[PDB]
Design a protein around this ligand. Structure first.
Ligand SMILES: Cn1cc(-c2ccc3occ(-c4cnn(Cc5ccccc5)c4)c3n2)cn1
Length: 335
């Protein structure tokens, strides 16, 4: 089992000494290591489960990162740098530059207090820049979520907050990078039927209509809402209920998408508003703009961008290249 080979003090590839576990996901774990052959530099090492699905993703990710890292050697577009990879007791291990906390862990460890709007603006801009680089290179990420957006540096202050009695982290600089290219898919490759983590999954994915770069835009809009509220507006683990929540937040789905779904197993959604699930969706969900916490124009600008990212029709949906020009980002450009 992986626990036999990922302990503090273990040495991987005769050079990488484990000093901490940074976290786990379905894929395995990421550990922080000292690289004794690079002058003691700390790196991150992703230790992949020895299971075919994950091994296959890791091999794919290695090829995608080789491509992205060679194309953008300065990481101008903020995709994490892979340093090398190796095998350890049958596990694929990928070595990366050491980044800071995931945006998920940062918000979670703060009791789900939302990010400041000024930080959201900077983060959103960088996420759009980064993922647009993928889209410029005939790639779609497919698994964008706060866990896969990491802070570059550990540029925060921490203290034991008297009020809550737990420790709070406060961000100083919000710069990010994008990680996890194990689901990333080239335009000309086989597209998996099911992609994305449910809460970030676009309607064309749910409806098996075909997906491409626009499904990433949908996921980013969901991420930005989460950063702003501290929670998802789609609190569900069921596809039909997910669609009903979309309908309540965004309005009815377009006829053309309903009529294409040859898997019209969900259809007007066939949904009882008066059932337990129906009552839950009406309580939990409301039109998008009602989630705004301020009527100040910068909040309106953020919500306008989110609404465009959550456009049902993936053709009409704003592209990332267009998103970068949106008014929300003007504060970044006001020299
Ligand atoms: C999926 N993936 C992560 C990297 C990755 C790459 C470089 C990294 O420098 C630091 C981390 C780091 C910080 N928290 N975590 C926990 C975690 C995050 C995301 C998902 C699971 C665990 C990792 C890190 N991670 C490459 N693929």
């Amino acid at each position: 089992s992986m626990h036999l080979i990922c302990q503090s003090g273990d040495v991987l590839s005769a050079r990488y000494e484990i000093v901490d576990t940074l976290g786990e996901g379905a894929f395995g774990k990421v550990v922080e290591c000292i690289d004794h052959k690079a002058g003691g530099r700390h790196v991150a090492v992703k230790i992949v489960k020895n299971v075919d699905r994950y091994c296959e993703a890791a091999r794919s990710e290695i090829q995608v990162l080789e491509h992205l890292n060679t194309t953008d050697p300065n990481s101008t577009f903020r995709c994490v740098q892979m340093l090398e990879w190796f095998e350890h007791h049958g596990h694929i291990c990928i070595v990366f530059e050491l980044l800071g906390l995931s945006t998920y862990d940062f918000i979670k460890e703060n009791g789900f207090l939302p990010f400041r709007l000024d930080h959201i603006r900077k983060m959103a801009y960088q996420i759009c820049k980064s993922v647009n680089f993928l889209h410029s290179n005939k790639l779609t990420h497919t698994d964008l979520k706060p866990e896969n957006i990491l802070f570059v540096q550990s540029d925060y202050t921490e203290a034991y907050n008297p009020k809550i009695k737990r420790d709070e982290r406060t961000l100083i600089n919000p710069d990010i990078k994008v990680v996890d290219f194990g689901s990333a898919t080239y335009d000309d490759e086989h597209h998996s039927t099911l992609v994305s983590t449910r809460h970030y999954r676009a309607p064309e994915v749910i409806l098996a209509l075909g997906w491409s770069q626009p499904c990433d835009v949908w996921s980013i809009g969901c991420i930005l809402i989460e950063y702003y509220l501290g929670f998802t507006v789609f609190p569900t683990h069921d596809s039909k209920e997910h669609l009903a929540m979309m309908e309540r937040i965004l309005g009815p789905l377009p006829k053309h998408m309903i009529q294409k779904t040859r898997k019209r197993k969900y259809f007007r959604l066939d949904w009882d508003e008066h059932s337990s699930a129906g009552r839950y969706v009406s309580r939990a969900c409301k039109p998008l703009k009602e989630f705004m916490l301020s009527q100040d124009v910068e909040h309106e600008r953020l919500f306008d961008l989110i609404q465009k990212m959550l456009e049902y029709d993936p053709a009409k949906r704003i592209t990332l290249r267009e998103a970068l020009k949106h008014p929300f980002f003007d504060l970044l450009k006001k020299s």
